[PDB]
Design a protein around this motif. Structure first.
Motif, PDB file in Angstrom:
ATOM      1  N   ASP A 159       0.764  -1.253   0.000  1.00 39.50           N
ATOM      2  CA  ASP A 159       0.000   0.000   0.000  1.00 39.50           C
ATOM      3  C   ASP A 159       0.799   1.310   0.000  1.00 39.50           C
ATOM      4  OD1 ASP A 159       0.992   0.081   2.653  1.00 39.50           O
ATOM      5  OD2 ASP A 159      -0.975  -0.263   3.535  1.00 39.50           O
ATOM      6  N   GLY A 160       2.112   1.226   0.035  1.00 41.13           N
ATOM      7  CA  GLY A 160       2.964   2.443   0.008  1.00 41.13           C
ATOM      8  C   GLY A 160       3.104   3.226   1.304  1.00 41.13           C
ATOM      9  N   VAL A 161       2.530   2.698   2.380  1.00 42.71           N
ATOM     10  CA  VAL A 161       2.598   3.355   3.708  1.00 42.71           C
ATOM     11  C   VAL A 161       3.973   3.202   4.336  1.00 42.71           C
ATOM     12  CG1 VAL A 161       1.599   3.505   6.031  1.00 42.71           C
ATOM     13  CG2 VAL A 161       0.113   3.073   4.072  1.00 42.71           C
ATOM     14  N   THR A 162       4.499   4.326   4.797  1.00 44.18           N
ATOM     15  CA  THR A 162       5.759   4.409   5.500  1.00 44.18           C
ATOM     16  C   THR A 162       5.629   4.476   7.045  1.00 44.18           C
ATOM     17  OG1 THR A 162       6.791   5.423   3.542  1.00 44.18           O
ATOM     18  CG2 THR A 162       7.931   5.728   5.631  1.00 44.18           C
ATOM     19  N   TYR A 163       6.401   3.640   7.727  1.00 44.55           N
ATOM     20  CA  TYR A 163       6.509   3.621   9.183  1.00 44.55           C
ATOM     21  C   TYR A 163       7.946   3.961   9.653  1.00 44.55           C
ATOM     22  CZ  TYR A 163       2.248   0.818   8.529  1.00 44.55           C
ATOM     23  OH  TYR A 163       1.024   0.314   8.147  1.00 44.55           O
ATOM     24  N   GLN A 164       8.038   4.629  10.792  1.00 40.19           N
ATOM     25  CA  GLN A 164       9.321   4.946  11.459  1.00 40.19           C
ATOM     26  C   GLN A 164       9.531   4.033  12.651  1.00 40.19           C
ATOM     27  OE1 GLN A 164       9.747   9.125  12.543  1.00 40.19           O
ATOM     28  NE2 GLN A 164      10.470   9.620  10.446  1.00 40.19           N
ATOM     29  N   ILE A 165      10.722   3.424  12.763  1.00 39.73           N
ATOM     30  CA  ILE A 165      10.984   2.443  13.814  1.00 39.73           C
ATOM     31  C   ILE A 165      12.276   2.917  14.520  1.00 39.73           C
ATOM     32  CG2 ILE A 165      11.312   0.021  14.434  1.00 39.73           C
ATOM     33  CD1 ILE A 165      10.205  -0.784  11.723  1.00 39.73           C
ATOM     34  N   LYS A 166      12.209   3.083  15.838  1.00 44.25           N
ATOM     35  CA  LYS A 166      13.355   3.619  16.571  1.00 44.25           C
ATOM     36  C   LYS A 166      13.512   3.106  17.998  1.00 44.25           C
ATOM     37  CE  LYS A 166      10.796   7.757  17.804  1.00 44.25           C
ATOM     38  NZ  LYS A 166      10.612   9.228  17.621  1.00 44.25           N
ATOM     39  N   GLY A 167      14.607   3.527  18.643  1.00 47.34           N
ATOM     40  CA  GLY A 167      14.821   3.271  20.081  1.00 47.34           C
ATOM     41  C   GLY A 167      15.046   1.793  20.382  1.00 47.34           C
ATOM     42  N   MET A 168      14.558   1.364  21.543  1.00 48.02           N
ATOM     43  CA  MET A 168      14.682  -0.025  22.017  1.00 48.02           C
ATOM     44  C   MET A 168      14.059  -0.997  20.979  1.00 48.02           C
ATOM     45  SD  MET A 168      12.929  -1.788  25.403  1.00 48.02           S
ATOM     46  CE  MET A 168      11.452  -2.192  24.400  1.00 48.02           C
ATOM     47  N   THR A 169      12.967  -0.581  20.359  1.00 49.22           N
ATOM     48  CA  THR A 169      12.270  -1.434  19.391  1.00 49.22           C
ATOM     49  C   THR A 169      13.179  -1.776  18.202  1.00 49.22           C
ATOM     50  OG1 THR A 169      10.101  -0.588  20.100  1.00 49.22           O
ATOM     51  CG2 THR A 169      10.220  -1.579  17.843  1.00 49.22           C
ATOM     52  N   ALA A 170      13.798  -0.747  17.645  1.00 53.07           N
ATOM     53  CA  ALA A 170      14.715  -0.893  16.505  1.00 53.07           C
ATOM     54  C   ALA A 170      15.919  -1.712  16.936  1.00 53.07           C
ATOM     55  CB  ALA A 170      15.144   0.450  15.960  1.00 53.07           C
ATOM     56  N   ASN A 171      16.442  -1.415  18.139  1.00 58.52           N
ATOM     57  CA  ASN A 171      17.582  -2.221  18.675  1.00 58.52           C
ATOM     58  C   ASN A 171      17.295  -3.725  18.784  1.00 58.52           C
ATOM     59  OD1 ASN A 171      20.160  -0.405  19.743  1.00 58.52           O
ATOM     60  ND2 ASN A 171      18.314   0.773  19.519  1.00 58.52           N
ATOM     61  N   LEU A 172      16.143  -4.095  19.339  1.00 56.44           N
ATOM     62  CA  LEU A 172      15.737  -5.479  19.487  1.00 56.44           C
ATOM     63  C   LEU A 172      15.542  -6.170  18.121  1.00 56.44           C
ATOM     64  CD1 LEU A 172      13.439  -5.266  22.721  1.00 56.44           C
ATOM     65  CD2 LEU A 172      15.758  -6.280  22.553  1.00 56.44           C
ATOM     66  N   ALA A 173      15.017  -5.414  17.160  1.00 57.10           N
ATOM     67  CA  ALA A 173      14.736  -5.986  15.825  1.00 57.10           C
ATOM     68  C   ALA A 173      16.040  -6.419  15.148  1.00 57.10           C
ATOM     69  CB  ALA A 173      13.981  -4.981  14.960  1.00 57.10           C
ATOM     70  N   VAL A 174      17.067  -5.547  15.207  1.00 53.85           N
ATOM     71  CA  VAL A 174      18.378  -5.846  14.636  1.00 53.85           C
ATOM     72  C   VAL A 174      19.009  -7.007  15.369  1.00 53.85           C
ATOM     73  CG1 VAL A 174      20.759  -4.984  14.401  1.00 53.85           C
ATOM     74  CG2 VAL A 174      18.822  -3.503  13.877  1.00 53.85           C
ATOM     75  N   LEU A 175      18.920  -7.025  16.712  1.00 56.51           N
ATOM     76  CA  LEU A 175      19.429  -8.173  17.453  1.00 56.51           C
ATOM     77  C   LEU A 175      18.849  -9.568  16.994  1.00 56.51           C
ATOM     78  CD1 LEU A 175      21.019  -9.564  19.894  1.00 56.51           C
ATOM     79  CD2 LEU A 175      19.028  -8.882  21.315  1.00 56.51           C
ATOM     80  N   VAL A 176      17.532  -9.654  16.855  1.00 60.69           N
ATOM     81  CA  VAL A 176      16.839 -10.874  16.419  1.00 60.69           C
ATOM     82  C   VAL A 176      17.307 -11.227  14.956  1.00 60.69           C
ATOM     83  CG1 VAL A 176      14.550 -11.780  15.815  1.00 60.69           C
ATOM     84  CG2 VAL A 176      14.913 -10.689  17.989  1.00 60.69           C
ATOM     85  N   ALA A 177      17.350 -10.236  14.076  1.00 60.79           N
ATOM     86  CA  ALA A 177      17.855 -10.416  12.669  1.00 60.79           C
ATOM     87  C   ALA A 177      19.272 -11.034  12.681  1.00 60.79           C
ATOM     88  CB  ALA A 177      17.845  -9.092  11.927  1.00 60.79           C
ATOM     89  N   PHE A 178      20.182 -10.470  13.502  1.00 52.14           N
ATOM     90  CA  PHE A 178      21.542 -11.043  13.583  1.00 52.14           C
ATOM     91  C   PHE A 178      21.564 -12.500  14.080  1.00 52.14           C
ATOM     92  CE2 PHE A 178      23.949  -6.712  14.535  1.00 52.14           C
ATOM     93  CZ  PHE A 178      23.811  -6.294  13.201  1.00 52.14           C
ATOM     94  N   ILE A 179      20.818 -12.788  15.150  1.00 53.43           N
ATOM     95  CA  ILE A 179      20.825 -14.123  15.761  1.00 53.43           C
ATOM     96  C   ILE A 179      20.403 -15.192  14.760  1.00 53.43           C
ATOM     97  CG2 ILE A 179      19.513 -15.627  17.379  1.00 53.43           C
ATOM     98  CD1 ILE A 179      19.502 -13.182  19.330  1.00 53.43           C
ATOM     99  N   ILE A 180      19.331 -14.881  14.037  1.00 50.95           N
ATOM    100  CA  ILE A 180      18.706 -15.877  13.126  1.00 50.95           C
ATOM    101  C   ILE A 180      19.337 -15.966  11.713  1.00 50.95           C
ATOM    102  CG2 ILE A 180      16.539 -16.507  11.964  1.00 50.95           C
ATOM    103  CD1 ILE A 180      15.043 -15.350  14.432  1.00 50.95           C
TER     104      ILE A 180
END
Ligand SMILES: Cc1ccc(Nc2ncnc3[nH]ncc23)cc1
Ligand SMILES: Cc1ccc(Nc2ncnc3[nH]ncc23)cc1
Ligand SMILES: Cc1ccc(Nc2ncnc3[nH]ncc23)cc1
Length: 186
Positions: A159-180
């Protein structure tokens, strides 16, 4: 399989209950992993504009422990049900990652959960304005914007909708991406 593989990677970073008894103000979050179209995704919420705390921001489902909760995982599962309609039989909690210390008196404990393929989110509009998925691989090559503070922008191709992701949330997301995803044949 892809799911077998993910869970085996996640298990090696599980700290379990090691920091669970310390005398903090206690919150839990659930990091919900969804398989779609041959790939892993994370589920996010957009907080309702009416909330006291961080109206309109992107976060994982979660909240404050209460006296009914048997343990910290129970908090995350209770909150996920209340916010987006996820039932316990629709999630396998795989591990407890490193907790986040904030503000000198607060500890936030993240749990990773594998989500049933037939789950469809029912957002509670008093708490959640929107629910969306991001492929996990995104967090290995994100689109970064400096507010200096690093902010990710994700555009849903549906749908072309843009979201902003930051802080602890963004940090945790990158951590899970690296682990897996780190060190995998193609
Ligand atoms: C993503 C996100 C979600 C909730 C908060 N809440 C808070 N923010 C600040 N102080 C607080 N004191 N108690 C709660 C609280 C912040 C960020
Ligand atoms: C001081 C303080 C206390 C609690 C939070 N809460 C959260 N922080 C982040 N994601 C969240 N998802 N649900 C709740 C929540 C933030 C700050
Ligand atoms: C509702 C729900 C219940 C169980 C799972 N777990 C798995 N399902 C399939 N293969 C797996 N391999 N390791 C775990 C795992 C996911 C969601």
């Amino acid at each position: 399989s892809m799911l077998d593989d993910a869970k085996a990677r996640l298990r090696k970073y599980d700290i379990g209950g090691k920091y669970s008894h310390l005398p903090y103000n206690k919150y839990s979050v659930l990091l919900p992993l969804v398989a779609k179209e041959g790939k892993l995704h994370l589920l996010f919420t957009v907080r309702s504009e009416k909330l006291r705390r961080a109206p309109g921001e992107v976060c994982f489902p979660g909240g404050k422990r209460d006296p009914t909760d048997m343990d910290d995982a129970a908090t995350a599962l209770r909150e996920a049900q209340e916010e987006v309609g996820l039932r316990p039989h629709q999630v396998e909690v795989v591990c407890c990652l490193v907790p986040c210390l904030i503000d000198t008196d607060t500890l936030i404990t993240p749990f990773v959960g594998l989500i049933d393929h037939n789950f469809q989110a029912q957002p509670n509009p008093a708490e959640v304005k929107d629910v969306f998925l991001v492929p996990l691989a995104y967090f290995l090559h994100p689109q970064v914007h400096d507010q200096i503070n690093h902010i990710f922008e994700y555009t849903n191709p549906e749908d072309g909708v843009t979201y902003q992701i930051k802080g602890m949330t963004a940090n945790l997301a990158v951590l899970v991406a690296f682990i897996i995803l780190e060190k995998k044949p193609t």
